[PDB]
Structure 1
């Protein structure tokens, strides 16, 4: 039994099937009242909602599904004929995410790809019939935001207008990625400030006694 399974169980026992809103609220409740977990959450969720509503992307790529929260969040807004592709490195999480989408009734809009971003991204054109992406949501390993962004470019998957939306760029932080897209005149950058809440998690003090110079 894992934390991720417990999240899914809580949803299955408390949310109304076919109701994505209901699913989102159950995950947000669990991860902030019952047991802390990595979770985009409703505050940042509203920023995502506004971005999707503004740009109405049709083909969306998500890096890092975890338990499906972001997938449910985005896919519930996607229009008929839209496709969300989600890459998830961990088979257990990929399975959790599939169940999350089934329960929300959003599974027809999403294709979960199980594997590493740098192995999958070069396959998107040939194997998944992708010309260019409308939107990319980055939420996977923080040190892979910059190299995957460059890999997307090299593969020809970005067009003028493609929206990159990156989470957790402050905490834990992705300073190389932020410096690149802000520095490069090929990206127009807006930063939406929000919060990350921790609750009932393991922390600690370090005691360090100076021994003198050496």
Structure 2
């Protein structure tokens, strides 16, 4: 399998010749880097902005959130009446997320469901929000990816896009020595399941920690 050698020189080049950065995004990345598999690279955040604008999304779902880099890139790409429903795992990094979203003037476009993502997603599938999302970004605990995926399939509209982060898990999914690891096994299972899942169109991208695109078929 022929490929481009991802030397620091080539990765620095991709960054320098494609990343449109600003002080707000840069400052958030810097702050996040000083804290305890949730560091979104700027190339990924920019792709997220592109895909949102590409499908004419006004309503999106997020599972994970953390300091809110992926959420900020999403919201910035949305129209003035757009909304991100962000299912935030914990309140620990909420006050950081809130600061940058306010600073970038997107806080009015972001709604936080604070607490257990299984519970917010269960409420959402039984709510008026069912089948109304244009895009879903799954970036939470890896053991719950199947649950998040099945819930996202009911939450997104036909033709909607589901995005699954970390599907390569540092290459561990491909590593035969990594045996019995719950996160690796769950990601291996969802990856295998997606290949033969006729409900979606599929693309697994070798960007950041592996980024899977699953378009819900009409």
Q: Which ranges of structure 1 fall in alignment gaps of 5 or more residues?
A: 1-19, 197-214
User: Match for residue 201 of structure 2?
Assistant: 188
Distance 1:190 1:92, change over 3 A: same
**Aligned partners of 2:39, 2:25: CA distance in 1, in Å?**
11
User: Match for residue 23 of structure 1?
Assistant: 24
Q: TM-score, normalised by structure 2?
A: 0.71
> Which protein shows a greater Rg?
1
Where relative contact order (Cα < 8 A, 6+ residues apart) is larger, the structure is 1
Q: CA RMSD in A?
A: 2.2
- Structure-to-structure mapping, 1:1-214, within 5 angstroms: 21-30=22-31, 35=34, 38-124=38-124, 129-132=128-131, 133-153=133-153, 156-171=154-169, 174-195=187-208
Question: How many pairs were matched up?
Answer: 172
Specify the SS of the correspondent of 1:113: strand
Native 8 Å contact 1:139 1:168 kept in 2: yes
| 1:77-119 Cα deviation digits (max 9, x unpaired) | 1012210010112112223222221122211000011011110
Distance 1:79 1:164, change over 3 A: same
| 1:10-45 Cα deviation digits (max 9, x unpaired) | xxxxxxxxxx9321122334556xx47631111212
Distance 1:56 1:152, change over 3 A: same
Specify the SS of the correspondent of 2:136: strand
Distance 1:152 1:44, change over 3 A: closer
Q: Which ranges of structure 2 fall in alignment gaps of 5 or more residues?
A: 1-20, 171-183, 210-218
**Aligned partners of 1:30, 1:46: CA distance in 2, in Å?**
18
Q: Which runs of 4+ in 1 moved over 4 A?
A: 29-32
**Aligned partners of 2:196, 2:108: CA distance in 1, in Å?**
38
**Aligned partners of 2:47, 2:206: CA distance in 1, in Å?**
10
Native 8 Å contact 1:182 1:188 kept in 2: no
Name the structure where strand makes up a greater proportion of residues. 2
Native 8 Å contact 1:88 1:116 kept in 2: yes
**Aligned partners of 1:192, 1:36: CA distance in 2, in Å?**
27
Q: TM-score, normalised by structure 1?
A: 0.72
Name the structure where helix makes up a greater proportion of residues. 1
